């Protein structure tokens, strides 16, 4: 009955009867689509697959359901596409290296056998979001939370080994599974937003001390191509203090998803000793995969993030890159013949971005536990111009700017964080933590910022001889030490890749200790101080084991003999 009357890129127009946001199946090959607009008897459909070869003489099928994701055991340590289709299973079914158009598989493995341990008894009353039991998912305690809409008395509840489609309990005559479906465009409910409490520790020094955010916060990472967004996000995905990590590859390179698949199983969590992959979920919609599925991948990853948050866990979502999602919005808007706003983007760009970032936050869950969803969004401004709409809109939504800089990347200073332009609006919520466990880090942080700023002021004068007084040269000296010994961090060195707080704090302390000594000694020249070569030893510290780092610090502390 329903028929296509037009095909324009990812946009299909069909005559028939439809509902807004209904998932439809387009053409004889039944491509997944979603109704985004209705005008009388016509429906405007964005198709999540390639539309080349589609015909005006073709049917469109109703489903009567919105776009959903299966939430349960089977997500962890696996890679999915923008629609939640498992790429490993696609490979195995097709026996091909290519992604076919129109393939439909269930998200969660239907044959894997799980062990369910109940936490409720028969006759217990249950409400939405309650933990009905737990499943061990390769070392992770997956909490089976009942859907927000289920409530009543447990008439039956089982225990033991089950697959995903099997009934594990019965409430008010309704079967409960190990999984439930949820519309990705719909934010998952909670009880109340909580105050920030605790810093988000990344394992990257510049992000942990200089511009930290709180757990449940959000940050933007804009930069030109080659500035280091992807590596920075992967570093966070590797070492972040978090229960669950969700990496969304939104419109980026296929090899970068493959890289994670290759490396994460070899790496060990510094907090559990378990391999990183077991806490990681990968969502991949590469640059050449269907453009509309980029939007799906963003809402999908957020929804899964909320799901683990609802279990009372801390979650981080890395989105690389949000600009590709913006391109998808612009393309859909263009086909719809909507009037473009600034830079060709639709006028509702800010509102759409907000639908993503407003999902972040620390909350009291429906089951009265505390959970957090932290969101890191990479941005890819054209030509590295930060004044563009995606970057600027994002800055009015997030809690920090982690700005990447061409000039630093140029000279291989990584992370290429611009320490003058970057900011965090959440230092007031995390300074408590650092004060308690490390008294002098607040002063030293201010000191680092003061030196980097002063060095910056001096480099313009330097373009008139490099003639400066010793009281000025000391800022270039200390600035170099902070940049090369603290801010810089090699993601691909076995010792420097991860920086625990102990190492981070100790580095700050030895730099500060060197600083107070050098200042006292101004009134012997700086030329004679630098000759001792203590600065070069400090700079090399970050490359050392840990039980070589501590030894070298002891060695440096004595060598700071101003006697």
């Amino acid at each position: 009955m329903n028929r296509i009357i037009s095909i324009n890129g990812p946009l299909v127009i069909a005559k028939g009867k439809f509902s807004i946001f209904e998932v439809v199946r387009v053409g004889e090959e039944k491509l997944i689509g979603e109704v985004i607009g209705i005008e009388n008897d016509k429906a405007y459909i964005q198709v999540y697959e390639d539309t080349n070869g589609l015909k005006v003489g073709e049917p469109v099928f109703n489903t009567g359901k919105p776009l959903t994701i299966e939430l349960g055991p089977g997500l962890l340590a696996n890679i999915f596409d923008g629609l939640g289709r498992p790429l490993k299973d696609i490979y195995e079914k097709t026996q091909s290296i290519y992604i076919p158009k129109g393939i439909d598989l269930p998200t969660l493995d239907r044959k894997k056998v799980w062990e369910f341990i109940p936490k409720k008894k028969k006759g217990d009353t249950i409400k939405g979001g309650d933990i009905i039991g737990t499943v061990n998912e390769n070392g992770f305690e997956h909490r089976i939370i009942v859907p927000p809409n289920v409530e009543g008395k447990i008439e039956e509840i089982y225990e033991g080994n089950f697959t995903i489609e099997e009934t594990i309990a019965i409430v008010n005559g309704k079967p409960i599974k190990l999984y439930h479906e949820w519309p990705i465009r719909k934010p998952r409910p909670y009880k109340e937003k909580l105050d920030y409490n605790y810093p988000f520790i990344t394992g990257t020094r510049v992000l942990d001390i200089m511009f930290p955010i709180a757990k449940g916060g959000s940050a933007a990472v804009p930069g030109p191509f080659g500035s280091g967004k992807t590596v920075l996000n992967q570093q966070i995905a590797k070492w972040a203090d978090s229960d669950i990590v969700i990496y969304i590859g939104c419109g980026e390179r296929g090899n970068e998803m493959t890289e994670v698949l290759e490396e994460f199983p070899k790496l060990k969590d510094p907090k559990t000793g378990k391999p990183l992959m077991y806490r990681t979920i990968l969502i991949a919609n590469t640059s050449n995969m269907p453009i509309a599925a980029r939007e799906a991948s963003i809402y999908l990853g957020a929804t899964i993030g909320e799901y683990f948050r609802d279990q009372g866990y801390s979650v981080v979502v890395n989105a690389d890159s949000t600009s590709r999602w913006a391109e998808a919005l612009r393309e859909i808007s263009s086909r719809l013949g909507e009037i473009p706003s600034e830079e060709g983007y639709p006028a509702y760009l800010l509102r759409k971005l907000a639908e993503f970032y407003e999902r972040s936050g620390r909350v009291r869950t429906l089951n009265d536990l505390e959970g957090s969803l932290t969101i890191i969004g990479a941005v890819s401004p054209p030509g590295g111009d930060f004044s563009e709409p995606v970057t600027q809109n994002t800055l009015r939504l997030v809690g920090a700017l982690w700005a990447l800089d061409s000039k630093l990347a140029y000279k291989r200073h990584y992370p290429a964080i611009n320490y003058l332009i970057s900011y965090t609006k959440q230092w007031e919520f995390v300074k408590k933590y650092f004060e308690e466990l490390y008294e002098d880090v607040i002063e030293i942080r201010e000191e680092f910022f003061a030196i980097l700023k002063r060095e910056s002021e001096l480099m313009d004068i330097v373009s008139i001889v490099g003639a400066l007084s010793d009281n000025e040269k000391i800022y270039l000296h200390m600035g170099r030490i902070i940049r090369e010994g603290f801010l810089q961090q090699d993601a691909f060195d076995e010792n420097d890749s991860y920086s625990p707080l102990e190492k981070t704090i100790e580095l700050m302390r030895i730099i500060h200790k060197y600083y107070v000594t050098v200042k006292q000694l101004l009134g012997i020249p700086l030329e004679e101080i630098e000759q001792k070569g203590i600065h070069e030893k400090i700079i090399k510290l970050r490359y050392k084991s840990l039980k070589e780092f501590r030894e070298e610090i002891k060695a440096i502390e004595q060598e700071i003999l101003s006697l």
Binding site: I38, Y44, S341, R351, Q392
Partner: protein, 407 residues
């Protein structure tokens, strides 16, 4: 009919511009009308079909003192719970104030902040904006001002599309300072319909005009962020098939912003003191939003990335900032101090510029150089919880002048 949220296209006999229409689970505002064709903007998420009940009027709110102590959305509907008394209903657009009926502001509201009080004081009934680069503590500045100038006044806070972290920062401070019971808060979320966003400052100012000019009160209105407001206006302007201007913003942006900012001022009966806050997109004051706002408000407090990087709070640029009506409220002594501060700081900054050349030039120019350094360190720099009397601010200036070698 047509649906693409938040927009619906609908057939109506004799459509009224601005007309409120009831649907099953929601309302809409008619934003366009030709013959029997209408375009409407949904109040919120809607998916049902579009059976229509026409109210036969534009959007109005019941005005009373019931709002005081409460939290509401952009439409003036209660979030916390209890509805205010229906009715005494008022057009939320209101009317232009007759300039014959106005009184020019002439009474300084002391903030306790030196960088404001001396050279750029806020006057009762004045409208003055805060311009900020992204990331700078504009919110802390507004709260510190509100804490000191509204001890006796009703505070109305309009949150326009800001994230929860931001509006909760305000709410929590109002609660901790016990100002919450004498405040009315209107919030439109960042992902809300654009119609709710642009109505937010209108319902807040409709209440403000009622409280100030009917109940004879002095009122303080804070609103943030005007850049989000302009974005919502552009969204609506683009849904209407309007011919876009600079950066997609509607041609009437100045006039629309004015229809908000000019709903402030002083009369014989009461006053509305208005502080609109905005983020300057690329830290560019020439961007259309801060530029048009500059042409309307009676001055602005401009925050500085440079001062922020020097760990100076509040990071106020003394020279880019301006209070147009300031002179109306200043004594001859106050005028003298403001002039000496502004002129000497400016000369100090010029001397600073060439100091990245001659290094360290004239004796006279070494005195101004030091003055500017001390102004930033001892005068501008001030704690978030610190209140300085105007006399204390003068004393600091006197002390700095001596340290510098200037008279």
């Amino acid at each position: 009919p047509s649906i693409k949220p938040p927009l619906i296209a609908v057939e109506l006999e004799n459509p009224m511009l601005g007309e409120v229409i009831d649907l099953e689970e929601t309302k809409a505002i008619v934003i366009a009308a030709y013959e029997n064709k209408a375009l409407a903007l949904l109040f919120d998420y809607y998916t049902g079909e579009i059976q229509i009940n026409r109210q036969g009027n534009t959007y109005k709110i019941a005005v009373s003192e019931d709002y005081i102590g409460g939290i509401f959305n952009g439409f003036g509907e209660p979030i916390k719970g209890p509805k205010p008394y229906p009715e005494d209903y008022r057009d939320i657009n209101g009317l232009a104030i007759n300039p014959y009926a106005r009184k020019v502001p002439n009474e300084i509201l002391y903030t306790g902040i030196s960088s404001i009080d001396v050279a750029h004081p806020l006057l009762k009934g004045q409208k003055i904006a805060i311009f900020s680069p992204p990331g700078l503590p504009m919110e802390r500045l507004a709260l510190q001002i509100a804490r000191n100038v509204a001890k006796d006044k009703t505070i109305i806070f309009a949150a326009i599309g800001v994230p929860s972290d931001i509006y909760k920062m305000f709410i929590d401070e109002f609660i901790n300072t016990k100002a919450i019971m004498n405040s009315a808060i209107f919030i439109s979320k960042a992902d809300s319909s654009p119609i709710e966003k642009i109505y937010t400052p209108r319902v807040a100012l409709t209440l403000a005009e009622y409280l100030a000019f009917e109940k004879n009160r002095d009122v303080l209105v804070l609103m943030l962020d005007m850049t989000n407001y302009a974005d919502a206006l552009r969204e609506i302007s683009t849904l209407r098939k309007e011919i876009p201007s600079r950066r997609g913003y509607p041609a009437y942006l100045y006039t629309d912003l004015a229809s908000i900012y000019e709903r402030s001022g002083l009369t014989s009966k009461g006053s509305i003191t208005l502080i609109p806050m905005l983020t300057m997109p690329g830290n560019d004051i020439t961007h259309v939003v801060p530029d048009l706002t500059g042409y309307i408000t009676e001055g602005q407090y401009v925050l500085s990335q440079d001062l922020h990087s020097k760990n100076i709070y509040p990071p106020i640029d003394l020279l880019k900032s301006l209070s147009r009506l300031a002179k109306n409220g200043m004594s001859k002594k106050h005028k003298k101090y403001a002039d000496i501060l502004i002129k000497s700081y400016a000369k100090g900054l010029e001397a600073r510029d060439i100091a990245t050349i001659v290094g360290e030039l004239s004796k006279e120019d070494k005195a101004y150089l030091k003055f500017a350094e001390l102004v930033e360190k001892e005068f501008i720099k001030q704690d978030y919880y610190e209140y300085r009397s105007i006399e204390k601010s003068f004393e600091i200036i006197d002390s700095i002048l001596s340290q510098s070698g200037l008279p």
